[PDB]
Design a protein around this ligand. Structure first.
Ligand code: 057
Length: 262
């Protein structure tokens, strides 16, 4: 998986650092996006590549390799439309059925990740990348973890900077992350998508979000959002781990409703 720096051209125009680039392959160039560094963070990038290396699914961003140069670089195939949130912000015209299509795709990718016993831990509309307006992939495995064969959750020892507004109660309270907590995260993602890329819990501190959730309160239905899709968000936001559905159940719900609506 170790790539030749000579065969990689980087634009100095920053995407997000993530940079666009071109990599001369078997016979053709391939358009790639490149995650670039700058002891502790070296191992994290290499772990993230180690995660990606092991995944093979149409709805997951595919890694080309790693590259030691000016710094450590992670080289992935480019999804050129960028993050789903920014896209929807700039494209209010997208029909509900198109958003339904896209979130279902994310759930198949997440069902695959659940079957493979990996936890994403950063599932948000910002880490959903569009290849085309009708093709989404999950990205950014920086926080992801392979689950031990004997356990269904990963336990963090003390938090870092966490995307708290996407995190399930059990993650906040007990530092426990399972595919069910990704399911809660997916709910917030669905909210973000049907709100055309708006920020969740606008203006609130994470601590205030935790307090709100503990009171049984949830975000309201987004303008125009199919009622069944809002119902699915709420099922995803089941406070109790044991009664929140897994992705197998979420995907099936999404698949059935999608096929019903087309
Ligand atoms: C047009 N476009 C394409 C991408 C993009 C990044 C990327 C990474 C891997 C594969 N495909 C990708 N496509 C992108 C990212 C961003 C972007 O803002 N990325 C952040 C800062 C959230 C990453 O932390 C903005 C625009 C983009």
């Amino acid at each position: 998986v170790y790539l030749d720096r000579k065969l990689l051209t980087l634009e100095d125009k920053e995407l997000g650092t993530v940079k666009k680039g071109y990599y001369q392959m078997k016979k053709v160039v391939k358009t790639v996006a490149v995650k670039i560094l700058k002891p502790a963070l070296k191992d994290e990038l290499l772990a993230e590549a180690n995660v990606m290396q092991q995944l093979d699914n149409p709805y997951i961003v595919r890694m080309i390799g790693i590259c030691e140069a000016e710094s450590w670089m992670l080289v992935m195939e480019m999804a050129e439309l960028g993050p789903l949130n920014k896209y929807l912000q700039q494209n209010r015209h997208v029909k509900d059925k198109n958003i339904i299509e896209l979130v279902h795709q994310v759930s198949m990718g997440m069902k695959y990740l659940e079957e493979s016993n990996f936890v994403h831990r950063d599932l948000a509309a910002r880490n959903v990348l569009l290849v085309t307006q009708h093709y989404a992939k999950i990205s950014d495995f920086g926080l992801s973890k392979a689950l031990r064969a004997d356990e269904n959750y990963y336990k963090a020892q003390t938090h870092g900077k966490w995307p708290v507004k996407w995190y399930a109660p059990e993650c906040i309270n007990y530092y426990k992350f399972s595919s069910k907590s990704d399911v809660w995260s997916f709910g917030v993602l669905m909210w973000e998508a049907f709100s055309y890329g708006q920020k969740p819990y606008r203006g609130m501190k994470g601590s205030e979000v935790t307090a709100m959730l503990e009171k049984g309160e949830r975000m309201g239905c987004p303008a125009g959002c199919p009622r069944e899709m809002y119902d699915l968000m709420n099922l995803c936001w089941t406070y109790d781990v044991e009664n929140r559905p897994g992705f197998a159940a979420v995907e099936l719900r999404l698949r059935n409703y999608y096929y019903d609506v087309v």
